UniProtKB/TrEMBL annotation:
Transmembrane segments: none annotated. It comes from Candida glabrata (Yeast). Keywords: Signal. This is Hyphally-regulated cell wall protein N-terminal domain-containing protein.
Length: 376
């Protein structure tokens, strides 16, 4: 169903349904389409906006006071877009989920689903355009609290051989929190993980588009990478609270001004990298402060876990593998002095980091850095 030069608001309660389904590609040209009062959006063929178009999705209002037993009996919210996403010529996709307020983090992770999972045609935002997503909030039990259940959203697609799912963000991708920083000035740990990109990238498979991640990328959550979505883009610049490179990533610059995260009485950065990472990662606003824990965590496997160590010189942080004698550096913006220590997980007490839309491999080891005072 195509829409031309129109302004239509489609309303679930007026219509008598909380499912808004469209089986054909949802095409907008010079139109503003608003979807209010829907609990389920299913667009298995994707959306295609152009010529100053606007897709507005607003989670239906809720005045219910946030409670535990309400969260159990709550209907589920789910928005799944498949196929392809295209936003061209100054168009916008504006999702707002602030009306959705949960009492506990693990409940938010199952009663809220936001899944852009495209295929061979991928996600495309022209540099004129914007994709803006305002998240729900939850009141307790965030990333610095108990394990396993970590709320997330996915922006990307799965790989289906031989077709990669491309990610082309020339414009603005912006994910916002609907809650404010705490009264102490920091975002608290009531975060969403933002799974960006595909599960894997076959450099030899087909790209209906090479990836390009040069646009305005600003995510108020824990970004999560499972494939090297940055290879082939120079001068990537990401503003986020933290991130999670579960696969090695190519050179980018990440600005952590919105970190560190406040939770359970302490501050910490949420920066994880994994085995295979090597040279090219630049961090901005990584503060060198004793009251901030875990500036960098490095997850890996080894038969001799002591093989990986860390040392900082001035503003450079070196991760050293003494087995292979290779080393790689993370380049910050201040003078750092660090110590390192280890965490080791087992097949029966595993670590799955902050979770993932795709199944996170088991990293039995974890090299953890911490700030120590600088030698005069």
């Amino acid at each position: 169903k195509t829409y031309e030069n129109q302004k239509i608001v489609i309303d679930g309660v007026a219509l008598g349904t909380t499912t808004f389904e469209d089986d054909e590609l949802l095409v907008l040209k010079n139109s503003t389409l608003t979807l209010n009062n829907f609990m389920n959006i299913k667009l298995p063929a994707g959306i295609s906006l152009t010529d100053n178009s606007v897709l507005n999705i607003n989670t239906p209002p809720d005045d219910t006071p946030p409670s535990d037993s309400y969260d159990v009996k709550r209907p589920q919210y789910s928005m799944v877009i498949n196929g392809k996403v295209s936003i061209d010529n100054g168009s916008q996709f504006v999702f707002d989920g602030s009306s959705l307020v949960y009492s506990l983090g693990p409940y938010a992770s199952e009663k809220f689903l936001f899944d852009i999972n495209t295929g061979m045609d991928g996600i495309f935002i022209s540099k004129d355009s914007t994709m803006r997503i305002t998240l729900p909030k939850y009141l307790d039990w965030g990333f610095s609290h108990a394990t396993t259940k970590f709320s997330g959203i996915h922006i990307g697609g799965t790989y289906k051989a031989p077709y990669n799912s491309p990610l082309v963000i020339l414009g603005t991708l912006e994910v916002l929190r609907s809650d404010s920083r705490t009264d102490d000035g920091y975002f608290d740990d009531n975060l969403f993980r933002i799974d960006l990109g595909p599960d894997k990238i076959d450099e030899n498979g087909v790209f209906t588009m090479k990836n390009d991640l040069s646009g305005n990328i600003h995510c108020q959550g824990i970004l999560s990478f499972f494939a090297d979505i940055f290879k082939g883009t120079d001068n990537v610049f990401i503003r986020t609270i933290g991130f999670q490179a579960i696969s090695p990533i190519s050179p980018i610059t990440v600005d952590l001004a919105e970190g560190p995260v406040q939770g359970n009485g302490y501050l910490r950065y949420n920066v994880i990298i994994s085995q295979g990472q090597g040279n090219g990662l630049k961090l901005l606003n990584l503060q060198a402060r004793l009251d901030i824990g875990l500036p960098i965590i490095y997850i890996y496997n080894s038969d001799n876990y002591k093989d990986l160590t860390a040392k900082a010189h001035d503003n450079v942080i070196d991760i050293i593998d003494h087995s292979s004698n290779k080393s790689f550096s993370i380049i910050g913006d201040r003078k750092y002095n660090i110590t390192y220590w280890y965490q080791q997980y087992t097949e029966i007490y595993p670590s799955y980091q902050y979770g993932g839309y795709f199944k996170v491999p088991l990293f039995k080891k974890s090299l953890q850095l911490d700030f120590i005072p600088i030698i005069e």
